[PDB]
Amino acid sequence: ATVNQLVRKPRNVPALEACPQKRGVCTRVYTTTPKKPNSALRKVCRVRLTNGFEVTSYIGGEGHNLQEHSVILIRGGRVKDLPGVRYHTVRGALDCSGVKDRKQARSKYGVKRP
Amino acid sequence: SMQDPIADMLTRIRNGQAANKAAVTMPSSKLKVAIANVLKEEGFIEDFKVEGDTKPELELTLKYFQGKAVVESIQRVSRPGLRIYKRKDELPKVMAGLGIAVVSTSKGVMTDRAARQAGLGGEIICYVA
RNA sequence: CGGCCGUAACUAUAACGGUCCUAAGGUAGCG
RNA sequence: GGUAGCUAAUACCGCAUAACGUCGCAAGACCAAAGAGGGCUCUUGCCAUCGGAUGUGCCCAGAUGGGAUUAGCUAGUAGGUGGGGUAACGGCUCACCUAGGCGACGAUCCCUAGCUGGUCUGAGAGGAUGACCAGCCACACUGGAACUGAGACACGGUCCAGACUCCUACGGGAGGCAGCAGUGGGGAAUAUUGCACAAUGGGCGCAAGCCUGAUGCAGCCAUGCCGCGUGUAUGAAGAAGCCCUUCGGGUUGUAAAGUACUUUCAGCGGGGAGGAAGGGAGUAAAGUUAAUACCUUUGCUCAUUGACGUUACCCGCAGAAGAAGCACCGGCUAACUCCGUGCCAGCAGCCGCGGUAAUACGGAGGGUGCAAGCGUUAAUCGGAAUUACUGGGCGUAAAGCGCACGCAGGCGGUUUGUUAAGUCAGAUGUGAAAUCCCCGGGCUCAACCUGGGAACUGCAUCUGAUACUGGCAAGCUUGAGUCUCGUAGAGGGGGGUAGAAUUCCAGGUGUAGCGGUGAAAUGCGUAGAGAUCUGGAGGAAUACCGGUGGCGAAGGCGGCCCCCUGGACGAAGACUGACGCUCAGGUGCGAAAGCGUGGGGAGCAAACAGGAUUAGAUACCCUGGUAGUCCACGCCGUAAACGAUGUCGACUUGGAGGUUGUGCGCGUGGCUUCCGGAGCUAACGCGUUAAGUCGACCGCCUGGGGAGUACGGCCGCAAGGUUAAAACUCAAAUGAAUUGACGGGGGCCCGCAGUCGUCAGCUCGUGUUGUGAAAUGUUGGGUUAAGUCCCGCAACGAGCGCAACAUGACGUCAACCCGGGCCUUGUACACACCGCCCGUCACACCAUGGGAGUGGGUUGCAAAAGAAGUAGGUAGCUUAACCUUCGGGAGGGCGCUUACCACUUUGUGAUUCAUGACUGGGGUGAAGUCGUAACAAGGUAACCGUAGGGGAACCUGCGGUUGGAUCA
Numbered sequence A: 001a002t003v004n005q006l007v008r009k010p011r012n013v014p015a016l017e018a019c020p021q022k023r024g025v026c027t028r029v030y031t032t033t034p035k036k037p038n039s040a041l042r043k044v045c046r047v048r049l050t051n052g053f054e055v056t057s058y059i060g061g062e063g064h065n066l067q068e069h070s071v072i073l074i075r076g077g078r079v080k081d082l083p084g085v086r087y088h089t090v091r092g093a094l095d096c097s098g099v100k101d102r103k104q105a106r107s108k109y110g111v112k113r114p
Numbered sequence B: 001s002m003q004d005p006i007a008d009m010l011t012r013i014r015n016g017q018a019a020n021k022a023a024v025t026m027p028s029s030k031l032k033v034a035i036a037n038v039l040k041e042e043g044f045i046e047d048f049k050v051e052g053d054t055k056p057e058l059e060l061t062l063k064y065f066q067g068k069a070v071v072e073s074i075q076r077v078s079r080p081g082l083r084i085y086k087r088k089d090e091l092p093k094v095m096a097g098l099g100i101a102v103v104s105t106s107k108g109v110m111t112d113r114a115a116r117q118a119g120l121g122g123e124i125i126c127y128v129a
Numbered sequence C: 001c002g003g004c005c006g007u008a009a010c011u012a013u014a015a016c017g018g019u020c021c022u023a024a025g026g027u028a029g030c031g
Numbered sequence D: 001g002g003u004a005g006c007u008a009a010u011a012c013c014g015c016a017u018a019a020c021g022u023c024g025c026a027a028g029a030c031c032a033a034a035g036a037g038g039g040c041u042c043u044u045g046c047c048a049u050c051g052g053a054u055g056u057g058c059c060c061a062g063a064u065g066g067g068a069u070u071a072g073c074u075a076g077u078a079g080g081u082g083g084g085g086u087a088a089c090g091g092c093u094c095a096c097c098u099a100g101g102c103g104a105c106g107a108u109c110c111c112u113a114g115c116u117g118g119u120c121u122g123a124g125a126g127g128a129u130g131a132c133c134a135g136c137c138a139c140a141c142u143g144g145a146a147c148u149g150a151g152a153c154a155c156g157g158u159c160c161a162g163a164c165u166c167c168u169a170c171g172g173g174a175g176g177c178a179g180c181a182g183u184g185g186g187g188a189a190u191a192u193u194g195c196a197c198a199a200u201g202g203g204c205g206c207a208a209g210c211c212u213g214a215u216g217c218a219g220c221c222a223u224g225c226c227g228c229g230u231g232u233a234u235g236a237a238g239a240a241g242c243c244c245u246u247c248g249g250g251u252u253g254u255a256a257a258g259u260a261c262u263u264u265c266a267g268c269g270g271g272g273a274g275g276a277a278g279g280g281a282g283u284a285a286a287g288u289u290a291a292u293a294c295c296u297u298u299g300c301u302c303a304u305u306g307a308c309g310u311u312a313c314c315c316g317c318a319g320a321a322g323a324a325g326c327a328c329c330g331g332c333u334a335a336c337u338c339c340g341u342g343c344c345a346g347c348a349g350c351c352g353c354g355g356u357a358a359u360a361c362g363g364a365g366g367g368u369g370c371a372a373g374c375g376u377u378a379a380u381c382g383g384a385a386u387u388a389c390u391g392g393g394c395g396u397a398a399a400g401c402g403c404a405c406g407c408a409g410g411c412g413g414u415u416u417g418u419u420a421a422g423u424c425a426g427a428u429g430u431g432a433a434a435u436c437c438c439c440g441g442g443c444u445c446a447a448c449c450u451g452g453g454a455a456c457u458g459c460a461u462c463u464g465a466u467a468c469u470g471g472c473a474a475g476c477u478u479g480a481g482u483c484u485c486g487u488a489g490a491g492g493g494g495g496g497u498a499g500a501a502u503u504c505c506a507g508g509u510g511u512a513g514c515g516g517u518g519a520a521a522u523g524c525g526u527a528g529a530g531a532u533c534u535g536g537a538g539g540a541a542u543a544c545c546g547g548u549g550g551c552g553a554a555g556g557c558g559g560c561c562c563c564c565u566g567g568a569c570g571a572a573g574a575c576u577g578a579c580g581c582u583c584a585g586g587u588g589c590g591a592a593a594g595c596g597u598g599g600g601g602a603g604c605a606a607a608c609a610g611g612a613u614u615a616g617a618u619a620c621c622c623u624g625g626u627a628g629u630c631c632a633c634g635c636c637g638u639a640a641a642c643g644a645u646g647u648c649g650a651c652u653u654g655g656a657g658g659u660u661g662u663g664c665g666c667g668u669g670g671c672u673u674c675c676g677g678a679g680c681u682a683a684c685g686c687g688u689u690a691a692g693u694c695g696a697c698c699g700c701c702u703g704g705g706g707a708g709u710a711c712g713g714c715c716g717c718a719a720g721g722u723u724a725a726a727a728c729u730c731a732a733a734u735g736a737a738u739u740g741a742c743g744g745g746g747g748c749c750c751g752c753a754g755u756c757g758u759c760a761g762c763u764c765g766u767g768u769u770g771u772g773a774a775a776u777g778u779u780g781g782g783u784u785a786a787g788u789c790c791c792g793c794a795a796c797g798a799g800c801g802c803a804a805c806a807u808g809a810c811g812u813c814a815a816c817c818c819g820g821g822c823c824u825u826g827u828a829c830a831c832a833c834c835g836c837c838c839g840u841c842a843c844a845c846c847a848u849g850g851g852a853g854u855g856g857g858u859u860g861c862a863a864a865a866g867a868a869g870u871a872g873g874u875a876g877c878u879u880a881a882c883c884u885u886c887g888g889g890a891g892g893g894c895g896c897u898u899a900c901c902a903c904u905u906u907g908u909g910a911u912u913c914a915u916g917a918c919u920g921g922g923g924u925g926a927a928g929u930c931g932u933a934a935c936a937a938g939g940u941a942a943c944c945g946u947a948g949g950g951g952a953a954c955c956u957g958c959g960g961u962u963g964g965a966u967c968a
């Protein structure tokens, strides 16, 4: 572009609303299949946030305690093999329990020190 | 149309050197002669001469050292589409001082070194190395 | 300016297929 | 609150005085004040005027977000004159006059937003940001208003209205934490209803002092930064217990224990700065003074002032005692093993990991990194030259408008003079302090605090410089243009005409077939076709010439003749004198299809019909055939409108052609084609007709999709065109080239045509070529059963195969037909054609368009409304100060009234957000249904525009493109 042209004319987590976490209520809790090449029953949940956005959130770790009308804290973080799953649930915050019988990376799964 | 005779002079030199021409000729002007004088004095060209009166032609004798052309680079800086002027403290160093910038000052066309010693800024015509 | 029956990896429906017959089986649009 | 009476002043009001004050040209006229305190004197206050200082009001220029899918906006509007108004200039206001003013240098409208010093990031230029600290602004429950005052249209003042909420005897009243603390609520999330005025500052006061949620401090919180601790030394028994192990051992690990010690910090007990300056007492002298008085100042001495606070800090006591976690260990990335699990459970920033020997999941052992923190999420800059000013691109990756003319704008050949706007130099003023940076200083160090400097890249003014750019003046001829003579040309528009052929019609001759295909059939024909001859009608196109030929801006243009007309080129001068280049917006031209009206209609041919083909065949093939193709006029405005290459100018080795001028075989112009050098390019390639080297200006790109789609605007008769998003979704999509494999590609050969296969292949070293994957050798000309051999050759040699003396190369299969070899070519294949892959349909989920409408926000316009306030007026009522002839008067107040105006009301638009039966496509999701459109000649070359048709991919017509294979 020429100088004269430039003179004339110069040169993933939206539901958080630039907050580190948002609280929400589980409107559905289910499993879903990952895309190829993966195979599992991945534990997700639809969540209506305190700002009115409804989003799918991932429930990480081995075994969870969430129903419909469970109150959870979500954070950012997509799940690569579930298209349109852009958030993770924080384990050991609010209703969502710590992962049972974890001993490594305990602080990532809300598990108090044995 | 022809809108920058100085860029044309620099290009004639650049292309002349790349083609191993002994000399290059062009339509003369007072500013072209002033620049040719700086190139001669700094030892980039061997000689120049103006011939004519109504239509004067400037001839520049190019110089080669060990086969290689001596003017290894020559680039227009200030140009009609974007004029470039520098204060004395902001005068450019070409090739860490080993090259020259040709500067038009209120005391005539001279090298950046001569401008800096005279305490003058001016228009940066071209870089030569 | 048509019937009949079947058919999709949850069901449901049938883009599809078969079969019969017609001069031709109602298109676009609308309901 | 009301009534009546009473009283004071530094409250209030005349009078006097009245000029370096106000008004006035002057003469003149006119305007003020307050006392109090200590012992006549001192101190302090009061009034006037002119200054200072400080603060504040006002004006101008530049700078300071986004949107044109906002282009016109404005009637006190723009200016003038006069009156009024203000502290003050001013449409500030009003009357009159003029018709202005603003706007593509973005007005108006819409959206977002407190601004700055700075802050974060960055090498810088930038980008992001404006919390804390400091400057400025604005606001104080919401809307409005003034009053008081030096100052307010006033956070803890007044009045009114409104929405809330609370007290009430129901008549009325009351309130405003966006001060500090605190409560509820919202939220992922942010603290005590603390102590003190001791210090600094502020108000009042002569002072003492009083007030001060400013401030100084304390509380809470790892929120950050910085410092310190959680022991130190020894210590092989290499103890157990771990864990791993080829059972040798290894490692944790000198780790632990044990044994010497140490005691910071925490706890407990004793000592002890500094933040205190001052203020209060009588005394000391001097200065005021009637005075050795009071007062003032300075000394003089004696008591005394700390919220923090059980302060900092110091000393002593006891004993390792009270004090280590978090993440990570597949690559990127520092750190590896075993066990459990078995595409599950789960992990994941990206690539990926997990289907029975998982360094990737989960645990353990070991290890790595950080450490009172560590991780995760969010957010900004960086890396990202990935918006490129510094600092990028556009032949094929995304990207040159289809082509031109041209206004604004940008840019401008050459010489002299002048100017001094840009530019440059110097000086002066300013650029707050803090911050950053440098050299120092102070807290034990550090963080932190702090002295001076540097910096603040800027802005303004003044004085100079004059090369370059600009302005002005005068030129110049080289760019650009005019003229003269001539040349070639399917350049354009209009009209005429010729010959060949097809079809049709009429007639003759003639007789059983014709036509068509891969083969058929439909069709035509004994009602005489087809064939052949003669005559006639009509339309459309112009064989040969004909050419990588010519002309045109592009689209395009082809018989011959005439008429009108545009451009190009050459020769030799003459002429004008920069008149130029580019061009957003604008305007024009613009293939084919299509559209409108009127004609025309031979041939051809979308649609359509029938016949075939096929599993089907809405196709390809056949027989027909309507629009259309043709003409006139108007519209459309698009094409692979392509050289996928914008226009103009300059420069830079060669070779071979074509075409068209021209000067003397030899020159010299124009246009054009092929090859190739340097150089350039990712490569392919381009290469004086550049994609090389430069300059001017324009257009355009910013991952693939969603989408050239939606919405809005504009245009169109319509078809549609043009401008042009977002949500959402993926980690790729893409270009060129390489090795294979494959082809219903080409060439040349072979075989009765465990495995491929006894097929003649498969490789390596070194050299050389290529940025590289790779290539060469091994290809080529011959010849052979044979990579057999010969000859050539950037290759030179060698190995395993062949051969020679049954023998199975390197490897493959996680064992005309068929098979195979060599060269070449296309490829979207690499799980390598048993490949890849397209669309409808079906299912699930996600975002989204349209949509009768439905509910809010904001806002334009036109009116209504009129609380309080201020101003104007004033029949009524009323009255402290002044005047009075004592009756009253002046002036005031109240009430009333008018003007302006908030709440609010009504009607009608605009815009935006939310939502909506139903409806449209879009995206995502191992293995669904229907076909097979594309990739090979993909089995009908593909694709572009357009039109019609069809379950779907698509098919068919017309024109266009090569980004098509084939030719032996």
Ligand SMILES: CN(C)[C@@H]1C(O)=C(C(N)=O)C(=O)[C@@]2(O)C(O)=C3C(=O)c4c(O)cccc4[C@@](C)(O)[C@H]3C[C@@H]12
Residues within 6 Å of the ligand: D067, D069, D711, D724, D725, D726
């Ligand atoms: C704010 N700004 C002016 C935006 C803009 O720059 C646009 C553009 N093409 O550059 C718009 O189209 C923009 O102007 C514009 O028009 C927008 C839209 O029309 C819509 C519509 O209609 C519906 C959904 C989303 C949008 C949108 C997000 O794309 C709008 C963006 C607009």
Ligand SMILES: [K+]
Residues within 6 Å of the ligand: A037, A038, A039, D343
């Ligand atoms: K997997």
Ligand SMILES: [K+]
Residues within 6 Å of the ligand: D076, D091
């Ligand atoms: K006004």
Ligand SMILES: [K+]
Residues within 6 Å of the ligand: none
């Ligand atoms: K006026």
Ligand SMILES: [K+]
Residues within 6 Å of the ligand: none
């Ligand atoms: K800034």
Ligand SMILES: [K+]
Residues within 6 Å of the ligand: none
């Ligand atoms: K307000």
Ligand SMILES: [K+]
Residues within 6 Å of the ligand: D149
């Ligand atoms: K006052």
Ligand SMILES: [K+]
Residues within 6 Å of the ligand: D197
């Ligand atoms: K105080």
Ligand SMILES: [K+]
Residues within 6 Å of the ligand: D388, D391
């Ligand atoms: K640039």
Ligand SMILES: [K+]
Residues within 6 Å of the ligand: none
């Ligand atoms: K000048």
Ligand SMILES: [K+]
Residues within 6 Å of the ligand: D407, D583
């Ligand atoms: K122009």
Ligand SMILES: [K+]
Residues within 6 Å of the ligand: D626
């Ligand atoms: K027809």
Ligand SMILES: [K+]
Residues within 6 Å of the ligand: D683, D770
């Ligand atoms: K290459």
Ligand SMILES: [K+]
Residues within 6 Å of the ligand: D646, D698, D699
């Ligand atoms: K352009």
Ligand SMILES: [K+]
Residues within 6 Å of the ligand: none
């Ligand atoms: K995207």
Ligand SMILES: [K+]
Residues within 6 Å of the ligand: none
């Ligand atoms: K080699």
